[PDB]
Amino acid sequence: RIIVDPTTGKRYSRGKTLGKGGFAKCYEMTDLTNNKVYAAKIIPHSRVSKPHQREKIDKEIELHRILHHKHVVQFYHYFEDKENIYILLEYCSRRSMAHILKARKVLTEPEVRYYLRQIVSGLKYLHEQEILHRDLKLGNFFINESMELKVGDFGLAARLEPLEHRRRTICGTPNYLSPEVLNKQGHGAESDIWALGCVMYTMLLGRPPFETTNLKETYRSIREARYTMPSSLLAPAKHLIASMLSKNPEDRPSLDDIIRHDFFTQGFTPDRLSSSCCHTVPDFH
Ligand SMILES: CC[C@@H]1C(=O)N(C)c2cnc(-n3ccnc3-c3ccccc3)nc2N1C1CCCC1
Numbered sequence: 177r178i179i180v181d182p183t184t185g186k187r188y189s190r191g192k193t194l195g196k197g198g199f200a201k202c203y204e205m206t207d208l209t210n211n212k213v214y215a216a217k218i219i220p221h222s223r224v225s226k227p228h229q230r231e232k233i234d235k236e237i238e239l240h241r242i243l244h245h246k247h248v249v250q251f252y253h254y255f256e257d258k259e260n261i262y263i264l265l266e267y268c269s270r271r272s273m274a275h276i277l278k279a280r281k282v283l284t285e286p287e288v289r290y291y292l293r294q295i296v297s298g299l300k301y302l303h304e305q306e307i308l309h310r311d312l313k314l315g316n317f318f319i320n321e322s323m324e325l326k327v328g329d330f331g332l333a334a335r336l337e338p339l340e341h342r343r344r345t346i347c348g349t350p351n352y353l354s355p356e357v358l359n360k361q362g363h364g365a366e367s368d369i370w371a372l373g374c375v376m377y378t379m380l381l382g383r384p385p386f387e388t389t390n391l392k393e394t395y396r397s398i399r400e401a402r403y404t405m406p407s408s409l410l411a412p413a414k415h416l417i418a419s420m421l422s423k424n425p426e427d428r429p430s431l432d433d434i435i436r437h438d439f440f441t442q443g444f445t446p447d448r449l450s451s452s453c454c455h456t457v458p459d460f461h
Pocket residue numbers: 194195196197202215216217249265266267268269270271272318328329
């Protein structure tokens with residue numbers, strides 16, 4: 177099937193399905209005018225009848241369409257026709273972290289340092305652009321053919337705000353709610369740092385440091401910021417995770433402080449990682 181951009185030219189071929197992605201059904205989509213393939217969201221209007229979810233996508237696009245970084249999903253184009261809304265994004269053949277970790281359960285440090293360096297780099301970009309991702313989670317870290325990491329799904333993203341006028345309500349439902357955001361103080365840049373801690377944790381142990389149900393039963397526990405630190409962690413990793421998951425946010429480290437932590441400096445880290453690290457654990461040193 178051929179899909180023409182009625183505002184322009186401009187013809188596209190639609191290929192393989194890629195699965196469900198909330199409102200979007202995903203499909204491979206080829207721009208016939210340059211023959212590159214792209215991962216596309218296709219949201220029919222029927223599913224965006226209601227004004228606030230209509231607004232939810234406008235923002236994702238508005239915020240996404242200005243982002244150019246090697247570790248941020250490269251937004252290509254978007255257009256609409258009578259039936260559907262169309263968003264083409266960087267095609268990431270080797271899926272997400274979420275997929276990888278299910279296979280391998282738990283990762284070796286060199287790779288954790290390999291993947292985190294990339295999550296952290298992409299996030300300086302956004303954070304310096306004054307944009308908060310607000311949903312860092314293994315699912316939203318996309319890997320490509322050449323084993324490179326890009327952060328995507330900017331569906332719960334927002335611009336930084338004056339701390340007095342900021343959104344207090346939990347927007348959407350993140351994977352990792354923070355203490356501050358639970359005391360109704362709103363999502364800060366550090367609330368992203370929070371998520372990174374939980375994420376590193378998961379990568380090293382295959383289970384999150386706190387429940388991810390967003391149930392009120394689980395709220396005191398997060399607010400206290402108390403969790404099991406297992407002995408299986410070397411001290412560098414232990415220490416780093418701890419500072420990242422500080423209870424009060426203004427104690428959490430900066431992104432620069434993070435890539436410069438012992439965990440980073442006194443291990444070894446590959447420039448290139450094989451594709452077999454998707455399924456198999458690597459060789460020593
Ligand atoms: C299009 C939405 C999302 C995405 O944003 N990108 C950039 C992406 C980029 N590349 C792929 N991609 C390409 C080949 N396989 C995938 C894929 C499939 C499942 C999960 C993640 C990626 N998928 C992407 N996805 C998937 C999320 C869930 C279903 C579609």
